[PDB]
């Protein structure tokens, strides 16, 4: 798990959904989505959770630090 492959990103769903096995609108560019008009996936806006890519931040490095 290094030369062949290191990172295994598949689900793009934000922290709360990916954990709860929910797929949301939140793309890989959820931040860039905020700039476009987006802000939080329907899940977060529905349950009032926390749209974050912390999962992304805990991968190869603190992507969002
Ligand atoms: Zn979500
Ligand atoms: Zn969310």
Swiss-Prot record:
Induction: By ethanol, threonine and acetaldehyde. Expression is autoregulated and subject to carbon catabolite repression.
Localization, UniProt: Nucleus
Gene behind the chain: alcR
Residues covered by region (Disordered): 3-35
Lineage of the species this protein comes from: Eukaryota, Fungi, Dikarya, Ascomycota, Pezizomycotina
General function of this protein: Positive regulatory protein for the ethanol regulon, alcA and aldA. It control positively its own expression and possibly in a negative fashion the expression of the gene coding for ADH-II.
Residues of the full protein shown: 1 to 63 of 821
Compositionally biased intervals (Basic and acidic residues): 15-33
Protein's recorded name: Regulatory protein alcR
Residues of the DNA-binding region: 14-51
Species the sequence originates in: Emericella nidulans (strain FGSC A4 / ATCC 38163 / CBS 112.46 / NRRL 194 / M139) (Aspergillus nidulans)
Superkingdom as given in the UniProt entry: Eukaryota
Ligand binding (Zn(2+) 2): 14, 41, 44, 51
Annotated positions binding Zn(2+) 1: 14, 17, 24, 41
């Amino acid at each position: 798990g290094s030369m062949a492959d290191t990172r295994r990103r598949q689900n793009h769903s934000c922290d709360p959904c990916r954990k709860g096995k929910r797929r949301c609108d939140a793309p890989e560019n959820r931040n860039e989505a905020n700039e476009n008009g987006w802000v939080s996936c329907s899940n977060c806006k529905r349950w009032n959770k926390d749209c974050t890519f912390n999962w992304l931040s805990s991968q190869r490095s603190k992507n969002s630090s």
